[PDB]
Assembly symmetry: D2
Homo-oligomer: 289 residues x 4
């Protein structure tokens, strides 16, 4: 395992971040063992994306097995950010601080409100948690452009964004600009469904025809080469998956794979212009006034 | 103006769809004048993205200035789709039906719920609207991969998705696969903030240095050549912007521009691997048991 | 080994043509050994490009070890083709016919005279050889564009031209147009010195860093995939090199190597405009009379 | 016009060199007029590539219209360089020196002998010319790789080599390496027949469809951006072509044209493997011993 600085927090994070999300088949000791396995593969960054009592119990017990400062703990808070408030923060206190037995969270990762501001009572509660050292930073998850007025908020220290080997320059520019402005960036969706379909049929078929590599491992290896990502979020629900993903961190992508990734970006298909409808255009032109 | 079939449900839609969104500057007469200009430039497809009374009043007057069957009217319903319920349908009746003075909507465009299903009471209410012809289709707006179980819902006839000249193959595959499966696709974000920033400095600087073309117009022309999009959503708050955008529909992109769009996709800035931290990895390995 | 049609002649040749070129350290035994190894690897096409007695002796012996009609034997005749004459025909009779113990040549491959015509006496000598059934065809070797009036000569059935994985479209167009116009095309210089230097430092370094492939074998494998070439000329001076080159005919290039070959074609270096010399230019413009 | 250092010689040459080649359809005053037009457009570098009495008379008269030391005059000596001898020197003295009325040549440009050495008597004669200050340098023209032992000869200060926008990296490496080793490099064949054909149909069609530019001028523009070339050789036979080519030296190629040039390098077409002939292969393998 390799380790990167998390933005300007001064905390080193493993190249992979393990997301823990509700799975009703899992009981508490499964969650504890999942985290134990991640720790044994050098993963110190965890993202809690669920709040079932068994998840909190097992995860909290595993986190307690190492000294707190060795871990980076993010709570993922979904829902319409514009509708968050004091009841949200009460729930966060029950789940994150009682459920996981934490004194502080490193990062609260919320949805992009698509606004320059947060609701007042929620932001005031966040400020309270920050001054109490119970919350060390706020992050914004987005699949588009986050309002710079929101990123300028003193609470906001991190962003989360998708990035994969078929991302274009808009997505790449978002992560690189955020990193150059000293935000920590968490990469998401290194292996999205659309790319799994492309890997089977078409220009990306090399992803399933490269000796010694799976398509998923190639997509992870590529995201791991991107300078602007502090860490790449992965989800794994058994030991074998954690071990394989962590193994990718120490491998080198073949240069021929890199060239095929670049080759594959080309796009040719164009459209002939669509039909004229002068009758329709004329009726619209002659609207009543 | 040119017109495209909207998915498998027949209707002709202008290659541009005009998004009408809350702007506290504009009163009802300004909204009416804006829709009038749109109509006069051949636009018959409008997406209402807001519920301010002045907006509903002016847009509804303007829509009534032509025969209803010439227009394709989409209501954009934001917010967490998992929290939609009967109150949502009440508010829709007041705003979209009474407020715009409509008997039916061509499309209700909701956020991706990131689930294969919608809340049951809301879905039951939508089924009621559909059986009465008050709602002709449901669309799902997403910046990721929509669950196929949701797309298989009989209500769902359309998807909306970002596409621009810096989009990669994941985004492109989503819209081509949707189209091939006979969904109507509305293109979004042809001119996102990230691309505006790239157009000023770097490999996309040609966007602001092409004789006879603005960067925005190049980005629109490119979107208009994508075969899978039924229509391209644009936001324009004055007559000049509407006229310029509609003029793009009839122009041909220079071949040197298309070549530069393809050459700009390349990306070569690839990390050196991060730090080992063997003390940290060992401490994590040696967690208590 | 695979066998291709040699242009429109109606005869077949091995995908490789072994060139035998003067080498002062080799004796007849050594030349015979080389030809034997090539025969044992399916090569039936040989190009004699030297006239040292030991070369003619050893090669003639080896050719006499199989039925003459199973071989395609090309004599390479260098020198200014505009200076060829009766002395040339006399020397050809000593070296090619008496020296190799041949009754006929499959091809006489001369330099491009950079003209539409051949010297009269030389051409009459070639017509005499063809009427005597001692010469089946004339070929023209060039590194530029051959005069089409020369190619229209009834004697000329074949051309020889460079092609390698760093060739561009002018080179490629020449060989494809010759093949489409029913000439046999012999590929030369699949592994020129300049590419051996590129293979060591720069964008072509992958040629020496591809698992299981040597740089020379990749360059031959690429030339073997060009559709316009009837055969690829190779030079080898030891058994083991002949066996490896022949083995490439049955191998498949990795798709990642093909991608790197395409990626390597890009060139971005540009110079700034040079110095103005207004006084020098004014002096030149003010020339007398 | 712009002027570049001619390798490490210490002298400057115009960025274009005008080649004057034998043309039976021109008379002395036509040649004089071509040289005059070149001079009036800043060209001071001329290559004489023929020896017709009318060519020598007209070109010599035009060269005498300016101070000799302002011109760079190259005599192009074709023929098999391995056959050069005393006759060649006598002919050079009669044609280049007496026929052009010159006391010295700035450069003698011979064909690549394809050897590390020149014939002794010829080389001794060149040494006599140099000691007499009648010859300032020897250049070697090649379409392949010149033996480094020949380039190391103290006489040889320049090379001439093809370079166009469809050239590959082997050609480009040759010229950049020569320039880095302090040779003057003359660029040849900026506009070869093969490229004229590609410009008419195919991926290079943009060469004849670019507003404001001819195909020829784009090809010359690209060659003028190559850093390793001291000058680009052109052959023009009318006033207006000379003026347009000189004008290219002061123009900037559009970035869209540059992108298309890089686009066009791609080559996709491949060959399936040819026929097996197991009986022929077996017959060759069982050659007699």
């Amino acid at each position: 395992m390799r380790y990167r600085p998390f933005g300007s927090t001064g905390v080193a994070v493993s190249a992979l971040t393990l997301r823990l999300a509700d799975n009703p088949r899992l009981r508490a000791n499964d969650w504890r063992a999942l985290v134990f396995t991640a720790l044994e593969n050098g993963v110190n960054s965890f993202q809690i994306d669920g709040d079932a009592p068994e998840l909190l119990k097992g995860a909290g017990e595993a986190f307690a097995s190492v000294e707190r400062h060795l871990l980076f703990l993010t709570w993922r808070l979904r829902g319409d950010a514009k509708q968050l408030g004091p009841h949200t923060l009460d729930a966060l206190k029950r789940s994150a601080f009682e459920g996981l037995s934490l004194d502080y969270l490193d990062l609260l990762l919320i949805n992009d409100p698509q606004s320059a501001s947060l609701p007042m009572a929620f932001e005031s509660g966040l400020q309270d948690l920050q001054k109490g050292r119970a919350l060390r930073g706020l992050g914004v998850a987005s699949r588009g452009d986050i309002d710079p007025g929101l990123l300028a908020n003193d609470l906001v220290t991190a962003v989360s964004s998708p990035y994969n080997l078929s991302s274009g320059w808009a997505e790449r520019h978002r992560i690189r600009q955020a990193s150059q402005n000293n935000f920590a960036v968490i990469g998401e969706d290194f292996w999205p469904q659309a790319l799994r379909e492309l890997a089977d049929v078409g220009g990306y078929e090399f992803l399933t025809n490269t000796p010694g590599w799976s398509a998923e491992d190639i997509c992870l290896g590529y995201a791991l080469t991107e300078p602007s990502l502090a860490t790449v979020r992965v989800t794994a629900d058994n030991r074998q998956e954690i071990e394989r993903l962590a193994a990718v961190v120490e491998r080198d992508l073949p240069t021929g794979v890199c060239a095929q990734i670049e080759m594959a970006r080309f796009s040719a298909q164009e459209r002939e212009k669509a039909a004229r409808r002068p009758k329709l255009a004329a009726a619209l032109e002659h609207h009543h006034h």
